[PDB]
Each structure stands twice: as structure tokens, then as C-alpha cells.
Amino acid sequence: GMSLANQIDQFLGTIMQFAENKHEILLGKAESDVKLTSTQEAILMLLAEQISTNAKIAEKLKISPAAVTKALKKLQEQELIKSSRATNDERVVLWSLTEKAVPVAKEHATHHEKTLSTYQELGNKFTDEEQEVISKFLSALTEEFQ
């Protein structure tokens, strides 16, 4: 609608219809089939880069042992990750991706990367002063939604 208030309202409407029956907000095929919680997904992506421990994971993603534990449980049940014993210390447990998960992580990261780069490109059309205005607009509108 022509007022900014109306435009803002229509834009949210557009996003709502787009998010309907989707797991995340992504641009593209939505061919990132598997449906993971944010934590599970962060862990998956984290392990896709490096083998790590329960405490290393909690640290890296600034979450509690409880949360890491619950997430590792689920990922393991879905055969996306697998535990193994630290070559140097029988007591410490290492985690990593299963074979079938490696490409699943890759394909789904790309999707995120394509979505981010589209936002980057749109952003690049605006000067720094303009990006600041957009930024202050998004923070303030973000506050209304909690």
C-alpha cells in the first residue's frame, strides 16, 4: 500500500505466506530436505567443519551441556553423526558426521549461502548511510515482534 505503514504490513504478509509450511526462510528449491532444530543444525554444520567433543561444542556455540546432549542424541538417532573414542584418552568422546550426512550438510549450507548472498547483493545497492537507516529500521521492527 502507499503509506510506509501499509507497505510494512504488506511485506510481513508476503513473508508469512512464504514461510507457511517451510522449516526456515530460504531462497531456492527448499531442497535441503532434512528438518533439524537450530541447535541440531548448528552442531551438524559445526561437525561438518571439525570433529569435536561435547564441551568443545558447548563452548563454540555458547550453549549448555544439557542442550548439546539433547542435540547429539537426536542427530545420532537419525544416523547423521557418530561417536568415537579419542585416540589419546579413552574417556573423551569425539563426534563426527556419518557418510550419508556429509553431502546433506554441504547441500544445505549452500542453500544458506545462496540466501545470504542474495541479501548481501541487495544490501550492496545502498550506501553505508542508507544501510544504517535500514539497519535501525530492522532492529526497531524486530523489537515489536517479541
Contact positions vs Zn ion (CB under 5 A): 24
Nearest distance in Å: CB 2, a second copy: 10
CA dist., res. 103 & res. 97, Å (int): 10
Q: In what order do the strands lie in the sheet with 52-53?
A: 52-53, 93-97, 81-85
Residue 131 interacting with a second copy (CB under 8 A): yes
CA dist., res. 59 & res. 52, Å (int): 11
| Interacting span for a second copy (CB under 8 A) from 13-21, 45-53, 71-79, 93-101 | 13-21
Nearer to a second copy, 90 or 129 (CB): 129
| Interacting span for a second copy (CB under 8 A) from 11-19, 47-55, 58-66, 85-93 | 11-19
Task: Name 129's Cβ contacts closer than 8 Å, sequence gap at least 6.
Answer: none
Beta bridge partners of 96: 82
All cell numbers assigned to 125:
545497492
Nearer to Zn ion, 5 or 140 (CB): 5
Among 73, 83, 92, 137, binds a second copy (CB under 8 A): 137
